[PDB]
Design a binder for this molecule. Structure first.
Ligand SMILES: [K+]
Ligand SMILES: [K+]
Ligand SMILES: [Mg+2]
Ligand SMILES: [Mg+2]
Ligand SMILES: [Mg+2]
Ligand SMILES: [Mg+2]
Ligand SMILES: [Mg+2]
Ligand SMILES: [Mg+2]
Ligand SMILES: [Mg+2]
Ligand SMILES: [Mg+2]
Ligand SMILES: [Mg+2]
Ligand SMILES: [Mg+2]
Ligand SMILES: [Mg+2]
Ligand SMILES: [Mg+2]
Ligand SMILES: [Mg+2]
Ligand SMILES: [Mg+2]
Ligand SMILES: [Mg+2]
Ligand SMILES: [Mg+2]
Ligand SMILES: [Mg+2]
Ligand SMILES: [Mg+2]
Ligand SMILES: [Mg+2]
Ligand SMILES: [Mg+2]
Ligand SMILES: [Mg+2]
Ligand SMILES: [Mg+2]
Ligand SMILES: [Mg+2]
Ligand SMILES: [Mg+2]
Ligand SMILES: [Mg+2]
Ligand SMILES: [Mg+2]
Ligand SMILES: [Mg+2]
Ligand SMILES: [Mg+2]
Ligand SMILES: [Mg+2]
Ligand SMILES: [Mg+2]
Ligand SMILES: [Mg+2]
Ligand SMILES: [Mg+2]
Ligand SMILES: [Mg+2]
Ligand SMILES: [Mg+2]
Ligand SMILES: [Mg+2]
Ligand SMILES: [Mg+2]
Ligand SMILES: [Mg+2]
Ligand SMILES: [Mg+2]
Ligand SMILES: [Mg+2]
Ligand SMILES: [Mg+2]
Ligand SMILES: [Mg+2]
Ligand SMILES: [Mg+2]
Ligand SMILES: [Mg+2]
Ligand SMILES: [Mg+2]
Ligand SMILES: [Mg+2]
Ligand SMILES: [Mg+2]
Ligand SMILES: [Mg+2]
Ligand SMILES: [Mg+2]
Ligand SMILES: [Mg+2]
Ligand SMILES: [Mg+2]
Ligand SMILES: [Mg+2]
Ligand SMILES: [Mg+2]
Ligand SMILES: [Mg+2]
Ligand SMILES: [Mg+2]
Ligand SMILES: [Mg+2]
Ligand SMILES: [Mg+2]
Ligand SMILES: [Mg+2]
Ligand SMILES: [Mg+2]
Ligand SMILES: [Mg+2]
Ligand SMILES: [Mg+2]
Ligand SMILES: [Mg+2]
Ligand SMILES: [Mg+2]
Ligand SMILES: [Mg+2]
Ligand SMILES: [Mg+2]
Ligand SMILES: [Mg+2]
Ligand SMILES: [Mg+2]
Ligand SMILES: [Mg+2]
Ligand SMILES: [Mg+2]
Ligand SMILES: [Mg+2]
Lengths: 97, 51, 51, 94
RNA sequence: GAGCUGUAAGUAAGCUUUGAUCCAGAGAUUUCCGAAUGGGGAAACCCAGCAUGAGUUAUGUCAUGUUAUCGAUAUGUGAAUACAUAGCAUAUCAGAAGGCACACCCGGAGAACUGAAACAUCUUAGUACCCGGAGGAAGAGAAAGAAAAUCGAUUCCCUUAGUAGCGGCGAGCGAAACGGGAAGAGCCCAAACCAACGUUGGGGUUGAGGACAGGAGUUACAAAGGACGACAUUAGACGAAUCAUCUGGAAAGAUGAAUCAAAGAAGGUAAUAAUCCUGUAGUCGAAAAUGUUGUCUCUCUUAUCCUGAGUACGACGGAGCACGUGAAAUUCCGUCGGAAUCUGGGAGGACCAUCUCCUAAGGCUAAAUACUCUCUAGUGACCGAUAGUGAACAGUACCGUGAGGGAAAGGUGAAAAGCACCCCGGAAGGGGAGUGAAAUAGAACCUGAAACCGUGUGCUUACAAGUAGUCAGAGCCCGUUAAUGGGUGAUGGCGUGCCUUUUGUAGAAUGAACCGGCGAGUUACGAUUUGAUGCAAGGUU
RNA sequence: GAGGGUAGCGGAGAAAUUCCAAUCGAACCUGGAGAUAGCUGGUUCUCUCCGAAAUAGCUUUAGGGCUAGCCUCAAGUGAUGA
RNA sequence: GACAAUGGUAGGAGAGCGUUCUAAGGGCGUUGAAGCAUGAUCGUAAGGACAUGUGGAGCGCUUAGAAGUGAGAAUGCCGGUG
RNA sequence: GACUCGGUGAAAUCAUAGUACCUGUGAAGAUGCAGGUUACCCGCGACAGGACGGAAAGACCCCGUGGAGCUUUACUGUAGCC
């Protein structure tokens, strides 16, 4: 309350809407995939069991932060472009599930 | 180690003496006591449960 | 009869009732002809026959 | 457990150590009147009456028939009857 | 298992081991009013009828039963009016009435102060009050569901989440599904269709089914009973172990030496007791009644047609849904209209098509859940007599026409041993003498503060102008927690209380007669921040 | 005089805002209820350190409020202060 | 040891006193507890002891925990007494 | 009635009071401050100039986004009626 001066959240406009079907992904960066041994097959079950992902949400997405120094096979719902490039560059493979 | 009925009955009426199981260990009871008298099996169970 | 609201153009609320369209006719209740208050919708339905 | 006519020892109070017969029993108040015990001097209007005043039943104790030592009294059954028996010896109390 | 005739002293008269008082189970009695019901009535009263019985020559009087209204059954009788019906009389039943803790529950009806810094939409709030109906719970409940990979009645807890949304898009209001749990149970009809004389039986009960072609039970699913046993409840019984000395009025305290413990909970006893008492741990116990219960028993069973019609649904007006008519689906009410019939119908948030899920317009159903006037057993870093109930001795006294409002008031002592007797006094009240450990514990009774009221007097005071003290200071009187002491104070300097509120108060602004007691930032749930601590790409339920 | 009737969103009034149980521009009692009170009053032990403001802007605002200004506490930063 | 600082309302910060209750430890008390009264006592304050009288059965201390935790004012409430 | 004596015996009020005047000062009208002036201690009967004397949280006046009663071609409703 501003004593009768029009309050701040009335002098400002409303903006936007909320998407009912908003999809939010659990995100794993490259630096978090470095805890697995070479040749590992990474899967949402393995990421959940290892403590990398607590809540899976709409699916797992791999992002490109950090350095990946281990060859892996990754099965995730989504990959960022740099994530795919750095997974394949290090000799590994990735699949979309 | 477990609920020993005869030990509990024999020690119940002695003032200053308290009886508990390994599972029932709590900080008030241990802190109040001046000494702990624990069986071998109870000691092993305590070591197992509390790591 | 059910209660509800009469609403003004400014949406001022005033309690009001909805009365049944009762009509006094003779319907032969329990074998004996008898003039009773009966709703016109009930007369349309056909459960109660006059005279 | 203390009855009229009993021989009792006074184990607490001014007359501790004295023995006497239980003259009266006041079970509602848990007091007994013991002859020669707790003598009061009352001012009679129409002299000075000197008579026993009751004392609490827990201040008297029965004497064992055999050792003549104070004893708590238990209870036993003999042919469908409850009989007082001394703890110290076990002999039945009169 | 020896006292007893309530509280509750006092006698008097009695009862009681030939078993009382007392406790529990069951019986008997149970005036009058009150729904109050034979009629009336200003409740606890008045006045009757009928039948039966006492009494009286007889009347008066009395005793007992019966007589309300509305319902229910069944025998007559009788209108307007011919049959009939309405109605009327009689017998039989004893169904309703009224009350409450009516706290929780369901329904009808339904505010306002208030918030929005005004106010009308909105909010308070479907709250308060009123009314109706019940139960030990109620309500809900067996998908025309949730959903979108499938689940499988209802309810309730956690969470989702103060999210989605609603909203003079203000103040505010505010879900649900998924997931985790408590509990867990499913069933009966209507219809087609058969048997019989439209009404009864058979049959059937759904997401495609139906028509046609031993195991289950009185907690729903049909409903009444017995036999025996069990347990528990409503009285009770047993139940270990201490002596001495000291101080004391009294020992349980101190001291010394012992004991018991499945019992060192607690209360009492002349001060503070495991061993003195009542008890405690533990064990035992029911003539009778009441339950809950198990077994036996006892019961019952072995796509041709149909599928809820004045219905669904629609318009208008409203309401309930978190949702204010809005893109408003979904549910209900009034008025008016008004379908389809498995190629059917409904929902998936306007609506259409596909797809998916379901199968309305009949009913029943335990448990998980809500509450406490109560009862039984217990508990408390809850009160301790201005507190804690209004009430420790009261819905009383008192106030009011009434509805209604509503106090104050606890403590002798261990034991009444409650002051024989003498003296003054009419008495009241005292002084002695006694009781008692104590009487300045004597009933107006534990302790007994302060205000306030008195008696005695060490210093001081009748030439003095004042918020009463303070600093300096002789004189006089005392002598301590022994301190460069205490009381008083001639005389001198300085000096307009306190609180509140104010620019500013000695203020002639506010408040307080004095003394005492009581009397005001608390708690819950959220948010944020700081300190502390644990763990750490994890932390935590 | 007696016995009755009219009741508060109401009665009654040869009318005065007049009476309705000793104050009637809307009786009394209880409940909502601790209504609301931007107003007045009150708010209880001690010491230690620091120490304001009575201004601006906006305000159905003017003895109220909000942000800024001025106080304090704690971490930073370090020439930026006088 | 040697330099500085220490008036203060609203208000911010810090440290303490005392009350009742609880836990643990250790104590006191009929050879007299709490309460009350008096005193020339101690501490920087809130406040703490001791001695004597009264009183007649409970009460301190230490550490920690919790609050119905502190009154002089409210035309405050109740009582008592001017 | 008042007044004196015997009996009985309230009240409003009240921060504590050993409570002078003048001129001044001061929240601008002083028992209480300054400077002077005046005044032995304690009653009783009287009078009302002051204690801005007592009584009632000013009825006037203003203020509160207070209330209530009343009015109307204020706004929005509504009983009723057509
Ligand atoms: K005793
Ligand atoms: K004034
Ligand atoms: Mg009656
Ligand atoms: Mg009658
Ligand atoms: Mg009657
Ligand atoms: Mg009947
Ligand atoms: Mg009946
Ligand atoms: Mg009832
Ligand atoms: Mg009821
Ligand atoms: Mg408002
Ligand atoms: Mg009701
Ligand atoms: Mg009811
Ligand atoms: Mg026994
Ligand atoms: Mg014993
Ligand atoms: Mg002894
Ligand atoms: Mg159907
Ligand atoms: Mg609605
Ligand atoms: Mg709806
Ligand atoms: Mg809608
Ligand atoms: Mg529909
Ligand atoms: Mg008291
Ligand atoms: Mg009381
Ligand atoms: Mg005397
Ligand atoms: Mg005398
Ligand atoms: Mg005497
Ligand atoms: Mg005497
Ligand atoms: Mg005394
Ligand atoms: Mg006294
Ligand atoms: Mg002179
Ligand atoms: Mg002189
Ligand atoms: Mg003077
Ligand atoms: Mg002076
Ligand atoms: Mg000021
Ligand atoms: Mg002024
Ligand atoms: Mg003053
Ligand atoms: Mg004055
Ligand atoms: Mg004022
Ligand atoms: Mg005053
Ligand atoms: Mg006071
Ligand atoms: Mg607050
Ligand atoms: Mg009335
Ligand atoms: Mg008149
Ligand atoms: Mg008038
Ligand atoms: Mg006029
Ligand atoms: Mg009047
Ligand atoms: Mg309210
Ligand atoms: Mg109020
Ligand atoms: Mg300073
Ligand atoms: Mg100004
Ligand atoms: Mg404006
Ligand atoms: Mg200072
Ligand atoms: Mg200074
Ligand atoms: Mg502070
Ligand atoms: Mg502190
Ligand atoms: Mg303290
Ligand atoms: Mg105490
Ligand atoms: Mg307090
Ligand atoms: Mg006061
Ligand atoms: Mg007085
Ligand atoms: Mg005269
Ligand atoms: Mg006189
Ligand atoms: Mg001044
Ligand atoms: Mg001047
Ligand atoms: Mg003057
Ligand atoms: Mg002067
Ligand atoms: Mg005079
Ligand atoms: Mg005068
Ligand atoms: Mg005046
Ligand atoms: Mg005023
Ligand atoms: Mg006024
Ligand atoms: Mg004036």
């Amino acid at each position: 309350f501003e004593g009768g001066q029009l309050p701040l959240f009335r002098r400002l406009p409303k903006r936007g809407f909320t998407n009912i079907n908003r999809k939010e992904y659990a995100i794993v960066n490259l630096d978090q995939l470095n805890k697995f041994e070479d040749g590992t097959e990474v899967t949402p079950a393995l990421l959940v069991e290892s403590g990398v992902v607590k809540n899976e949400k709409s699916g797992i997405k791999i992002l490109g932060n950090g350095s990946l120094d281990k060859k892996l096979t990754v099965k995730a719902h989504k990959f960022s472009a740099s994530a795919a490039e750095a997974i394949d560059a290090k000799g590994g493979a990735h699949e979309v599930i | 180690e477990n609920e020993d009925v005869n030990v509990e009955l024999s020690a119940r009426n002695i003032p200053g003496v308290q009886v508990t199981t390994a599972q029932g260990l709590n900080v008030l009871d241990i802190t109040n006591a001046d000494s702990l008298v624990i069986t071998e099996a109870a000691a092993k169970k305590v070591e197992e449960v509390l790591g | 009869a059910s209660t509800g609201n009469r609403r003004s153009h400014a949406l001022n609320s005033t309690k009001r009732r909805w009365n049944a369209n009762l009509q006094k006719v003779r319907i032969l209740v329990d074998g004996k002809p008898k003039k009773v208050w009966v709703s016109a919708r009930a007369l349309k339905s056909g459960k109660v026959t006059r005279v | 457990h203390i009855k009229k006519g009993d021989n009792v020892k006074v184990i607490a109070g001014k007359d501790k150590g004295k023995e006497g017969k239980v003259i009266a029993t006041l079970p509602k108040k848990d007091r007994v009147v013991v002859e020669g015990v707790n003598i009061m001097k009352k001012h009679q209007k129409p002299g000075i009456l000197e008579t026993e005043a009751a004392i609490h039943v827990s201040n008297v104790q029965l004497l064992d028939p055999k050792t003549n030592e104070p004893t708590r009294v238990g209870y036993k059954f003999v042919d469908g009857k409850k009989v007082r028996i001394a703890k110290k010896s076990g002999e039945e109390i009169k």
